[PDB]
């Protein structure tokens, strides 16, 4: 079995490189963040532009949805995060305390916490209601590329240019596990929380049993040497691994066999970001300065 993703929409309107795309948990929306300082909301099924959300003074490296799809959080070169009410577009909170670029962010499943990683080498845990920094984890010795909560929010995984993935107990802030085995440019928990998917800047993705400290799968064939490219588990149809690439393609692998099952062509710059729709076999992809567009792709499986 192989997917047959086909291009459905190309979404133009960002005026600099796109940095990340995320589908809302409820499946209705795609959010995109950009070096142009803007967040844009698009219809997930018709590609229709919905709105622009603004207020950051410098470009944005990441955006994430709350579990109820009502809030967004963005991470900016202006050293802050912002919490936004999506329906209105208003900035609800500005999260201050990082001393350098905020690179990555995520809500926990409860969506009372936000986790952030920064060039300042720290991971911060923030209260959504008050906007106050609850904890500053001295997580890494180099910029932090990714932060992600597990299914129940009890664990955080972080990755860094320093070459480490670390698993943190959310409540205590203590490091429970360091996968110390190249710069790590992306990490996230598997949907069940038992595995982590880690990208390294040696053109390699790895699926790890973090408790066992064992690498279970490796995915290669794409180009990833320069940028923190998002990777995804695709679970709505076939069980795929999805990633952007620096050769301007979207790569799709079979999770179990590790074979490449599809390459999506059409972007004209590095595909910095991909996202998988939560219920339909839909991929969103987005690219850097030479391209500046988002593409939506759909498959029968």
């Amino acid at each position: 079995v192989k997917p047959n993703y086909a291009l459905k929409f190309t979404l133009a309107g960002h005026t600099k490189a796109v940095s990340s795309v995320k589908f809302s948990p409820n499946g209705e929306w795609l959010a995109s963040s950009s070096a142009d300082k803007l967040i844009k909301i698009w219809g997930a099924y018709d590609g229709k532009f919905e709105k622009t959300i603004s207020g950051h003074k410098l470009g944005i490296s990441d955006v994430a949805w709350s579990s109820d799809s009502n809030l967004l959080v963005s991470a900016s070169d202006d050293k802050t995060l912002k919490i936004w009410d999506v329906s209105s577009g208003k900035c609800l909170k500005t999260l201050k305390g990082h001393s350098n670029y905020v690179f990555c962010c995520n809500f926990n499943p409860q969506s009372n916490l936000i986790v952030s990683g920064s060039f300042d080498e720290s991971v911060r845990i923030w209260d959504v209601k008050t906007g106050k920094c609850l904890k500053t984890l001295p997580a890494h010795s180099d910029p932090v590329s990714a932060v992600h909560f597990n299914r129940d929010g009890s664990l955080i995984v972080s990755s860094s240019y320093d070459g480490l993935c670390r698993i943190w107990d959310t409540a205590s802030g203590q490091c429970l596990k360091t996968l110390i085995d190249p710069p790590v440019s992306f990490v996230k928990f598997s949907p069940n929380g038992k595995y982590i998917l880690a990208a390294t800047l040696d053109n390699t993705l790895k699926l790890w049993d973090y408790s066992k400290g064992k690498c279970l799968k490796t995915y290669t064939g794409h180009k990833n040497e320069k940028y923190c490219i998002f990777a995804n588990f695709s679970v709505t149809g076939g069980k795929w691994i999805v990633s952007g690439s620096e050769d301007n393609l979207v790569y799709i692998w079979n999770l179990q066999t590790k074979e490449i099952v599809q390459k999506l062509q059409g972007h004209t710059d590095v595909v910095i970001s991909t996202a998988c729709h939560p219920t339909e076999n839909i991929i969103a992809s987005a690219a850097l300065e030479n391209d500046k567009t988002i593409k939506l792709w759909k498959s029968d499986c």
């Binding site: 490189a17 950009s34 490296s61 900016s76 070169d77 690179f103 910029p143 940028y227």
Partner: peptide, 10 residues
């Protein structure tokens, strides 16, 4: 720009 849209290093 934005840090993610630039090459990743300290």
């Amino acid at each position: 720009g934005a840090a993610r849209c630039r090459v990743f290093s300290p």
